[PDB]
Amino acid sequence: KKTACVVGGTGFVASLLVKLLLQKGYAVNTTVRDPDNQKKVSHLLELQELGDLKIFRADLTDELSFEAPIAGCDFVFHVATPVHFIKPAIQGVVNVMKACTRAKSVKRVILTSSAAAVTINQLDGTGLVVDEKNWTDIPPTWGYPASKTLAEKAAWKFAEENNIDLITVIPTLMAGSSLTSDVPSSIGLAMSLITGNEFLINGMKGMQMLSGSVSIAHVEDVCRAHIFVAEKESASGRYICCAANTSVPELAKFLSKRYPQYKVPTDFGDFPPKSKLIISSEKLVKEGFSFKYGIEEIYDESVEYFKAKGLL
Ligand SMILES: [Cl-]
Numbered sequence: 001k002k003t004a005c006v007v008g009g010t011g012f013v014a015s016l017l018v019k020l021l022l023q024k025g026y027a028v029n030t031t032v033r034d035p036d037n038q039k040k041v042s043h044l045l046e047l048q049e050l051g052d053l054k055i056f057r058a059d060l061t062d063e064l065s066f067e068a069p070i071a072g073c074d075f076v077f078h079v080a081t082p083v084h085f086i087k088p089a090i091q092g093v094v095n096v097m098k099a100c101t102r103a104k105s106v107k108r109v110i111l112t113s114s115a116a117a118v119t120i121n122q123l124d125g126t127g128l129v130v131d132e133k134n135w136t137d138i139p140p141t142w143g144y145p146a147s148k149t150l151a152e153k154a155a156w157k158f159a160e161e162n163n164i165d166l167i168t169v170i171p172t173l174m175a176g177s178s179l180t181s182d183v184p185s186s187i188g189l190a191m192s193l194i195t196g197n198e199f200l201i202n203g204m205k206g207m208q209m210l211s212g213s214v215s216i217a218h219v220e221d222v223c224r225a226h227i228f229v230a231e232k233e234s235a236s237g238r239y240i241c242c243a244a245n246t247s248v249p250e251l252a253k254f255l256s257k258r259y260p261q262y263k264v265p266t267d268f269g270d271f272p273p274k275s276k277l278i279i280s281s282e283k284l285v286k287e288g289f290s291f292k293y294g295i296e297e298i299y300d301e302s303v304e305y306f307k308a309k310g311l312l
Pocket residue numbers: 011012013014079081082083
């Protein structure tokens with residue numbers, strides 16, 4: 001039986017990964033900052049039924065915290081840029097990876113890092129000063145998916161210097177459903193054209209602009225891609241993971257028609273109807289990975305998830 005460590009198992013990407021590794025027959029160790037917070041870890045507890053799951057207290061600042069959950073594991077998965085519901089992240093990454101240098105069992109470290117995820121978190125912010133023209137004439141920084149965060153740049157140099165086999169996976173706007181109690185922000189952004197939430201619609205516009213694109217994947221495709229590049233020995237480097245590319249206005253038309261039951265706005269004025277960028281997942285697809293979910297499917301599950309959360 002093989003063992004994998006997933007850091008920060010209460011996250012959106014990380015909890016689903018734990019689940020999928022359990023179903024694939026891995027034993028899984030996961031770390032949470034405080035396991036006694038029973039509301040926070042409830043979904044992890046539920047995963048114990050699926051198999052050999054062990055939950056360790058560990059802290060990203062610490063770096064002696066990681067020796068125990070990582071002991072005996074073949075793979076260590078860490079999400080650097082988790083989705084909400086910089087110097088900390090850089091430091092977490094080096095710290096997990098330092099621990100990994102001492103654990104001779106570790107075959108590969110798999111890091112989740114997206115400059116887009118940082119922008120997505122910031123786009124759904126607080127204290128935004130809104131006026132009469134602000135709300136149309138659209139703080140968040142640039143989130144081009146192909147850009148390397150400093151966290152990521154750190155990992156590659158550390159890996160280069162310490163003979164660690166590192167792979168990075170680069171997701172963009174993730175939707176579908178979550179195992180977490182709170183709704184991840186990414187799903188809110190994605191589902192804004194359906195809820196009609198103008199604030200998060202403005203978010204999606206901001207993303208087209210600051211990310212150069214409106215690209216999307218089901219979180220479950222993103223998690224399977226992590227397991228795939230872990231297991232496939234000749235895999236290397238970085239892997240962008242997204243299923244579909246679009247623009248907000250092109251997307252809104254698509255969803256208008258697929259979901260006539262909902263008041264989907266289609267008139268965007270002179271807002272750019274083509275994005276500057278198309279984000280390609282061809283490298284991942286050529287390694288042998290197939291996406292199980294297309295845009296139709298990403299939205300159905302998200303809709304059903306939003307219903308059950310009483311948001312539709
Ligand atoms: Cl996440």
